């Protein structure tokens, strides 16, 4: 047959037309409406798409449950299935547990994670009612949240653990009852019974065949030995997705029973290839458990691999035999199977064959040995024997589902009763373009004895045998070479201890105690939290809610998938999709475009280019960027055109068929090629106070050096996505999007289309995620989607694919500081000199400002009297980059930190005395004379110091290091000063506007949007205190250029004191209205006094305004106020590096920080949790790469970085500062959203501690620049090791920019 | 009356906190809005007509 | 608006109102959450009353404006805003009438 | 308002009126309207949050 039958949510879909091409989440939300489950990457990363599948299994006879990415998931693997999605389990009248504990526990800030980690948990708890703390944590390895910084979701998850004023009350969470889950579809138990048949399905160009028996697949191979076996899709999913591979016909072999099979055997355990990694898992776990130590040493490794690979929902479908025959240089199997000596069996028809995999299996790139007519049946895993000894390497980029930098499996055999080899494997990914066998170097340690002469030979021979071009792919070379002789020495060292409990202690000699911890396989302790905040007053109303931790207001609804984000909208049913076609040169003129394969397309509209826009082709907020290119190219990434058409499928294979023909330009890419080209914004910015030369010739000291700061990507979950709706009259459009900046798309699209301002209208309900990505260059799909939406007359809709986002809309711009600093041997500054370069790329933007607020930052929290900053911004042939959440304050800090922590080495005195003594007090002046006012730094200083017992955990610090070779920990305390206001003075203002219906409701509306940050909660908890009426009879929808005009973006974390002013003013003037008829009726309820002002014919209407007041920089005079008020916060951080992989553990942070008087500690903890853990990701894990010629490499998840849930401090307390009132701004209240994130430098600098001691242990002043990755951490952890693998020019795969 | 245009609403439904946007011929959005909030159970704040 | 010209009236009013051409405004549509508790169009009065409610939100923005005119009391009508918009006053306002 | 484009997911309503001046209503069949092609549903007073 060709209908495909499955369920989803219990309701039966027959789909009489199945295409192969068809994925799950592009069924659910297009076909059947069901939008919670979301797109947020489309590779299996993130997680935003999970959803749970259940089955009967007819090879275990049970029902069973599991989590997949409906991403990945072709419908036509899914017949005779049943779904459940967020919409399946729970709404907002009847919240399943899961989505009860997520919203109430503060779990949920932007919302568009929520219903995947939702499913998670869900599918958990249906396989697991009572599941350990690990088993939660372990959950969620396939899950991304940008948002929340992870701790309240499993904070509030840890309620449903067997072994489990505040800000959530775990006590009135509803249990949870099994028997109210929904019924596996009936119709699925009675089909149990029917031998599965064969289908057949046809789409537009793949045909898929099901195939139920090995006769059928056998015969299907031989016939076609093109037929694309497809089990889990996790391979060939993205191969179709992102490399446009097309494989018109595809065989689907997962029912066979023979391919998922597991059969013990006398040599060990033979797995069906089409068996997913999951029963790998479990079956491995059980017989690891219950069999001798003796025989499991190479299951054990596999185990290792298999807990850093992915997360649950691609182990769930993913099939050994897939990871096999992918066969990816860095397959974390393939060098554990090559190294066991593991048994393949190979069938075609009439043929059968065992082999043992060994170099021969792999020819070549992404090769196996087998025929094309033939398919992997099943692989062997070995017990181990007597005297045989496995160890399981990987390091990566993060431990969480990360691609291997290098991996590997290795065994040693011994001659029984001796320490003398009889066999040795040492087998290796990411070393080649291919799983390699160290082939040369093993042979000739065979009779050796297991000693120091033998890892200093095997050393040597891998340092040898083991080269990497410098153009090697992936780079990173000296880092790789690196870790293949570390990972030998810890197989060496587990080899010796393995001896010892084998009773040859003698033969073999003791392991020295301070090398035992580099054997350990990795382990944290359980998590522990703390958040301290304040109690509001006792006499404060129970419905006055300012001050309280009210939940945000759409935590529930993100909870359940109800939540509605711009793509969720449903489409018109004249509705348009649009692609827009970018550069793919850095520098080029455009000689040609030929459309002629884009017209071939079913559905394809057109192609808009330059000619296409009616009025101006000139935009960006400086007025120097094209709507689309004309002429020449100047990024990669650059958009030349859109087209339109009927799908986001025929959109995106039409703009494959735009072919660009160019002429290459010179091409300006990295800092140093602008400052030789001298390309820059504008000229250069300073700031300079005292006599610099005075100072330095005081100083005791002088320390010059240079520091390196890395971009970042803002992966907002939610990519940018606009809708445009054209009205058909006078020019009038709508537009429905996800920016933080509604004013300036609707001036960039009025100016492009020729219209007033007054005919385009600009809404936003909400983003999942901003954090200043959609503050501007939100608009480049904006403009496109409109000019779509203008020439055919229809509504056009654009949302990006997570690669598309990732390479146009550019990030935090990466900074070169050279600094020169002047200090006492007491460690008081007296002199800092320090230029500035940062990448703008190839638009201005808000690149000026930027290196305004790092100038006005580069003070951080210390008293300077010599001092001069300069900032240059260079122009480049890059996407432009723009606003991420900090705006140049943490560049400019991290530098300041860094000479600081030179001063405190050059010195020989304690850090943390070094930064007291040179930090501001109360009244003093910054460098751009600002008098600093109600300074409560030193109090979260001493707060943070004696809470974190600072002291203390410094001895233990000192001790750990004399008594650890090869770990080290390291502990810092971070001081910053964050100066609140847009440095532009007249972005400090806002508006809103309030109406009161007759029933007495009340629909507020203001100029901020929300992104996950808690605006409209605290706009509603403001209004509800200024009008006296509880919260729940007050209410925001959206926010619209029609209701408020001439909006700020949402931006420079001031959008609560600027929104929340306007939002007073507004209720005041409501209340004076009122006050003749609260007068004539003060007990009568409020209802009473609004329909009294009706029938008196009283506006019940009222706009609100704010501006900040006296503010106003000026660079030419180094005077007036640039800030309203500062913001203030100490970190301290503890880590524990692996001076052999580079790899570490955050340990501890305890941050105290001045919120003021919160409008809601619930909020403004999640504020500084999740700011701090994007500056954790800042500092130490995200890292762009880029080709020479400037095409940015990192475009996904797989290979960009963001903090998993694995990766936040281990222990982490949280306290906003007490009795702290701020009364420049509303209700007493700080901002807070990017103040904090600077703070996550304690984690940096604790790492620089740590390398320091591994340093002493194995050149002071040692370089470590931003990012402090695991490449940099190992690098400069010199040891034996490093000095066995340490050109130009000599292109490489990458250039730092 | 005879007004050439009939009476007409299409409702479009929000799915959050009872929200509904209303496009009506109608000479009285305010008793629409009212109308209809009453019979639904909602605030007034929830409709726009 | 059901025929009866009333944008057309109320643009009119708030081009005089304004002192700036019929040209440079624009009436999209009527409701609920822009105005709130709004009377039916009946009764004839509907340029009455909305006129003058037309007429107050215009005067409100034109006080707002006025020192922006004196500074320069011939530069155009859109120097006069962009003036008031970066001095950052409001350039929103409600108007009423009974 | 009926010349704004229909959502790829909206549906029609129509309406059921009296055919009595005054009357009780004893009874509403609703099967040969179940038995119609693209059927939702048939709300009544009961309906009503
Ligand atoms: C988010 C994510 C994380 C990942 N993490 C890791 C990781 O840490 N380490 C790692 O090594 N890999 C990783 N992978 C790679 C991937 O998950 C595995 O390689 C997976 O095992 C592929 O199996 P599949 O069933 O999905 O393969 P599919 O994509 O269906 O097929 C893959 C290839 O194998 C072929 N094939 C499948 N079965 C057979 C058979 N029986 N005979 C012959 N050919 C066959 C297909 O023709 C195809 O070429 C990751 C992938 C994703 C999406
Ligand atoms: N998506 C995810 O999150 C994860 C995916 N995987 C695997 O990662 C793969 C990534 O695929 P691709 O990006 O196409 O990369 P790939 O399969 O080409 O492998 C890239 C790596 O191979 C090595 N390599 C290739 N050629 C080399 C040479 N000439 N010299 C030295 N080393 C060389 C390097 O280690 C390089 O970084 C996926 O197909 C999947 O199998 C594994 C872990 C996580
Ligand atoms: O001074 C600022 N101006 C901005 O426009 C902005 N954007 C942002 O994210 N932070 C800041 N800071
Ligand atoms: S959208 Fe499927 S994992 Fe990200
Ligand atoms: S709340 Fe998790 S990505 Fe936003």
Same mark, same amino acid.
């Not at 005297?387 to 990360?402: L, P, T, V």
């Not at 990914?429 to 200093?456: F, H, V």
């Not at 000026?848 to 006005?856: C, D, G, P």
């Given at each position: 047959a060709d209908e495909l039958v499955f369920f989803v949510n219990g309701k039966k879909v027959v789909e009489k037309n199945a295409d192969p091409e068809t994925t799950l989440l592009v069924y659910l939300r297009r076909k059947l409406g069901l939008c919670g489950t979301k797109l947020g990457?489309?590779?299996?990363?993130?997680? %935003?798409?999970?959803?749970?599948?259940?089955? /009967?299994?007819?090879?275990?006879?049970k029902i069973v449950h599991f989590s997949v990415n409906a991403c990945l998931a072709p419908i036509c693997s899914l017949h005779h299935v049943a779904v459940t999605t967020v919409e399946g389990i729970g709404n907002t009248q009847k919240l399943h547990p899961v989505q009860?504990?997520?919203?109430?526990?503060?779990?949920?800030?932007?919302?568009?994670?929520?219903?995947?980690?939702?499913?998670?948990?869900?599918?958990?708890?249906?396989? #697991?009612?009572?599941?350990?703390?690990?088993?939660?944590?372990?959950?969620?390895?396939?899950?991304?949240?940008?948002?929340?910084?992870?701790?309240?979701?499993?904070?509030?998850?840890?309620?449903?653990?067997?072994?489990?004023?505040?800000?959530?009350?775990?006590?009135?969470?509803?249990?949870?009852?099994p028997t109210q889950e929904p019924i596996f579809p009936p119709e699925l138990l009675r089909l149990k019974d029917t031998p599965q048949k064969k289908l057949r399905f046809e789409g537009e160009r793949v045909t898929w065949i099901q195939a139920s028996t090995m006769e059928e697949l056998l015969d299907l191979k031989a016939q076609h030995?093109?037929?694309?076996?497809?089990?889990?899709?996790?391979?060939?999913?993205?191969?179709?997705?992102?490399?446009?591979?097309?494989?018109?016909?595809?065989?689907?072999?997962?029912?066979?029973?023979?391919?998922?099979?597991?059969?013990?055997?006398?040599?060990?355990?033979?797995?069906? &290839?089409?068996?997913?990694? +999951?029963?790998?898992? +479990?079956?491995? &776990?059980?017989?690891?458990?219950?069999?001798?130590? #003796?025989?499991?040493?190479?299951?054990?490794?596999?185990?290792?691999?298999?807990?850093?690979?992915?997360?649950? =929902?691609?182990?769930?479908?993913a099939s050994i035999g897939g990871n096999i025959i992918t066969a990816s240089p860095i397959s974390d199997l393939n060098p554990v199977f090559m190294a066991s000596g593991a048994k393949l069996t190979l069938v075609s028809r009439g043929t059968r064959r065992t082999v043992?995999?060994?170099?021969?299996?792999?020819?070549?790139?992404?090769?196996?040995?087998?025929?094309?007519?033939?398919?992997?049946?099943?692989?062997?895993?070995?017990?181990?024997?007597?005297?045989?000894?496995?160890?399981?390497?990987?390091?990566?980029?993060?431990?969480?589902?990360?691609?291997?930098?290098?991996?590997?499996?290795?065994?040693?055999?011994?001659?029984?009763?001796?320490?003398?080899? #009889?066999?040795? +494997?040492?087998?290796?990914?990411?070393?080649?373009?291919?799983?390699?066998?160290? $082939?040369? !170097?093993?042979?000739?340690?065979?009779?050796?004895?297991?000693?120091?002469?033998?890892?200093? +030979?095997?050393?040597?021979? $891998?340092?040898?045998?083991?080269?990497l071009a410098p153009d090697a792919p992936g780079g990173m070379v000296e880092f790789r070479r690196t870790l293949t002789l570390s990972f030998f020495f810890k197989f060496y060292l587990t080899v010796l201890q393995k001896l010892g409990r084998a009773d040859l202690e003698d033969m073999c000699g003791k392991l020295d105690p301070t090398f035992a911890s580099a054997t350990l396989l990795f382990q944290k302790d359980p998590p522990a939290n703390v958040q301290l905040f304040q109690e509001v007053p006792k006499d404060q109303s129970e419905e006055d809610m300012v001050g309280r931790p009210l939940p945000h207001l759409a935590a529930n609804m993100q909870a359940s998938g109800e939540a509605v984000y711009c793509d969720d909208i449903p489409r018109y049913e004249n509705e348009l999709s649009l692609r827009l076609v970018t550069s793919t040169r850095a520098h080029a003129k455009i000689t040609s475009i030929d459309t002629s394969e884009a017209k071939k397309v079913p559905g394809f509209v057109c192609f808009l280019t330059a000619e296409d826009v009616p009025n101006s082709n000139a935009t960006?907020?400086?007025?120097?960027?094209?709507?689309?290119?004309?002429?020449?190219?100047?990024?990669?990434?650059?958009?030349?055109?859109?087209?339109?058409?009927?799908?986001?499928?025929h959109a995106q294979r039409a703009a494959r068929g735009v072919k660009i023909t160019y002429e290459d330009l010179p091409a300006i890419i990295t800092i140093q090629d602008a400052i030789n080209n001298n390309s820059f914004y504008g000229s250069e910015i300073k700031i300079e106070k005292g006599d610099l030369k005075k100072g330095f010739s005081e100083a005791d000291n002088v320390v010059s050096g240079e520091l390196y700061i890395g971009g970042q990507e803002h992966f907002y979950l939610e990519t940018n996505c606009t809708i445009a709706?054209?009205?058909?009259? &006078?020019?009038?459009?709508?537009?429905?999007?996800?920016?933080?900046?509604?004013?300036?798309? #609707?001036?960039?699209?009025?100016?492009?289309?020729?219209?007033?301002?007054?005919?385009?209208?600009?809404?936003?309900?909400?983003?999942?995620?901003?954090?200043?990505?959609?503050?501007?260059?939100?608009?480049?799909?904006?403009?496109?989607? %409109? $000019?779509?939406?203008?020439?055919?007359?229809?509504?056009?809709?654009?949302? $990006?694919?997570?690669?598309?986002?990732?390479?146009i809309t550019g990030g935090r711009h990466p900074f070169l500081a050279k600094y020169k600093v002047g200090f006492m041997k007491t460690g008081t500054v007296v002199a800092l000199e320090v230029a500035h370069?940062?990448?703008?790329?190839? !638009?201005?933007?808000?690149?000026?400002?930027?290196?305004?607020?790092?100038?006005?930052?580069?003070?951080? %929290? /210390?008293?300077?009297?010599?001092?001069?900053? !300069?900032?240059?911004?260079?122009?480049?042939?890059?996407?432009?980059?723009?606003?991420?959440?900090?705006?140049?304050?943490?560049?400019?800090?991290?530098?300041?930190? /860094?000479?600081?922590?030179?001063?405190?080495?050059?010195?020989?005195?304690?850090?943390e005395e070094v930064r007291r003594k040179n930090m501001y007090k109360e009244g003093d002046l910054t460098h751009?004379? =600002?008098?600093?006012?109600?300074?409560?730094?030193?109090?979260?200083?001493?707060?943070?110091? &004696?809470?974190? =017992? /600072?002291?203390?955990?410094?001895?233990?610090?000192?001790?750990?290091?004399?008594?650890?070779?090869?770990?080290?920990?390291?502990?810092?305390?971070?001081?910053?000063?964050?100066?609140?206001?847009?440095?532009?003075?007249?972005?400090?203002?806002?508006?809103?506007?309030?109406?009161?219906? !007759?029933?007495?409701?009340?629909?507020?509306?203001?100029?901020?949007?929300?992104?996950?940050?808690?605006?409209?909660?605290?706009?509603?908890?403001?209004?509800?205190?200024?009008?006296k009426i509880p919260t729940s009879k007050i209410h925001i929808s959206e926010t619209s250029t029609n209701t408020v005009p001439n909006t700020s973006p949402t931006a420079a974390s001031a959008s609560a004191d600027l929104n929340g002013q306007g939002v007073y003013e507004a209720c005041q003037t409501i209340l004076k209205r009122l006050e003749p008829f609260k007068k004539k009726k003060p007990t009568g309820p409020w209802e009473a006094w609004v329909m009294d002002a009706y029938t008196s014919a009283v506006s019940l209407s009222a706009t609100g305004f704010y501006k900040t007041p006296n503010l106003g920089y000026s660079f030419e005079t180094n005077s007036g106020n640039p800030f309203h008020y500062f913001s203030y916060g100490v970190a301290c951080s503890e880590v524990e590096i692996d001076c052999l992989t580079g790899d570490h553990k955050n340990l501890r942070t305890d941050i105290v920080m001045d919120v003021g008087s919160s409008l809601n500690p619930a909020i403004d903890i999640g504020q500084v949790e999740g700011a701090f853990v994007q500056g954790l990701g800042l500092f130490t894990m995200e890292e762009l790469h880029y080709s020479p010629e400037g095409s940015l490499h990192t475009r996904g998840p797989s290979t960009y970085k963001i903090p998993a849930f694995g990766s936040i401090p281990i222990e982490f307390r949280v306290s906003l500062l007490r009795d702290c009132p701020n009364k420049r701004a509303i209700y007493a209240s700080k901002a807070v959203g990017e103040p904090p994130l600077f703070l996550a430098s304690s984690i940096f600098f604790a790492i620089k501690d740590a390398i320091r001691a591994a340093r002493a242990q194995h050149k002071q002043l040692f370089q470590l620049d931003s990012p402090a990755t695991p490449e940099k951490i190992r690098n400069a952890c010199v040891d034996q090791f490093t000095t066995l693998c340490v050109p130009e020019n000599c292109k490489s795969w990458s250039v730092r920019i």
């Open positions: 990457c489309g590779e299996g990363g993130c997680g %935003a798409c999970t959803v749970m599948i259940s089955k /009967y299994d007819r090879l275990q006879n009860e504990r997520i919203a109430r526990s503060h779990g949920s800030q932007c919302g568009f994670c929520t219903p995947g980690i939702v499913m998670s948990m869900y599918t958990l708890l249906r396989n #697991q009612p009572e599941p350990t703390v690990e088993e939660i944590e372990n959950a969620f390895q396939g899950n991304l949240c940008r948002c929340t910084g992870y701790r309240p979701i499993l904070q509030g998850f840890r309620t449903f653990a067997k072994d489990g004023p505040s800000l959530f009350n775990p006590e009135d969470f509803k249990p949870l009852d030995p093109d037929a694309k076996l497809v089990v889990g899709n996790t391979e060939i999913g993205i191969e179709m997705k992102f490399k446009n591979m097309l494989f018109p016909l595809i065989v689907c072999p997962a029912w066979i029973p023979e391919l998922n099979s597991v059969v013990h055997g006398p040599e060990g355990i033979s797995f069906g &290839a089409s068996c997913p990694l +999951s029963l790998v898992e +479990s079956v491995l &776990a059980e017989e690891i458990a219950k069999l001798p130590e #003796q025989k499991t040493e190479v299951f054990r490794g596999v185990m290792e691999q298999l807990r850093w690979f992915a997360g649950k =929902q691609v182990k769930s479908v043992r995999m060994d170099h021969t299996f792999f020819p070549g790139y992404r090769k196996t040995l087998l025929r094309p007519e033939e398919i992997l049946l099943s692989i062997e895993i070995p017990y181990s024997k007597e005297g045989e000894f496995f160890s399981a390497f990987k390091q990566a980029s993060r431990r969480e589902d990360d691609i291997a930098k290098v991996t590997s499996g290795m065994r040693v055999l011994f001659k029984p009763g001796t320490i003398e080899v #009889q066999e040795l +494997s040492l087998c290796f990914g990411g070393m080649a373009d291919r799983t390699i066998s160290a $082939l040369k !170097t093993t042979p000739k340690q065979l009779s050796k004895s297991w000693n120091e002469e033998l890892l200093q +030979s095997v050393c040597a021979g $891998l340092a040898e045998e083991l080269q960006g907020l400086f007025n120097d960027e094209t709507v689309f290119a004309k002429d020449e190219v100047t990024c990669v990434g650059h958009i030349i055109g859109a087209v339109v058409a009927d799908t986001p499928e709706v054209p009205k058909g009259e &006078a020019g009038e459009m709508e537009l429905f999007v996800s920016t933080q900046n509604t004013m300036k798309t #609707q001036s960039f699209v009025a100016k492009m289309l020729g219209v007033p301002d007054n005919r385009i209208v600009v809404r936003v309900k909400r983003m999942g995620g901003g954090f200043g990505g959609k503050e501007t260059r939100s608009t480049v799909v904006s403009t496109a989607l %409109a $000019l779509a939406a203008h020439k055919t007359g229809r509504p056009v809709r654009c949302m $990006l694919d997570r690669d598309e986002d990732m390479l370069f940062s990448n703008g790329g190839n !638009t201005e933007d808000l690149s000026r400002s930027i290196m305004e607020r790092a100038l006005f930052h580069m003070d951080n %929290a /210390y008293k300077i009297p010599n001092i001069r900053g !300069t900032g240059r911004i260079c122009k480049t042939n890059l996407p432009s980059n723009t606003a991420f959440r900090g705006f140049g304050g943490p560049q400019g800090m991290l530098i300041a930190e /860094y000479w600081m922590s030179e001063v405190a080495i050059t010195c020989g005195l304690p850090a751009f004379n =600002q008098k600093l006012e109600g300074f409560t730094l030193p109090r979260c200083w001493d707060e943070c110091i &004696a809470s974190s =017992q /600072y002291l203390a955990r410094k001895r233990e610090v000192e001790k750990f290091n004399r008594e650890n070779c090869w770990k080290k920990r390291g502990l810092c305390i971070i001081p910053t000063k964050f100066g609140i206001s847009f440095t532009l003075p007249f972005l400090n203002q806002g508006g809103a506007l309030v109406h009161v219906y !007759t029933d007495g409701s009340v629909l507020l509306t203001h100029g901020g949007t929300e992104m996950g940050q808690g605006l409209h909660t605290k706009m509603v908890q403001v209004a509800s205190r200024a009008l």
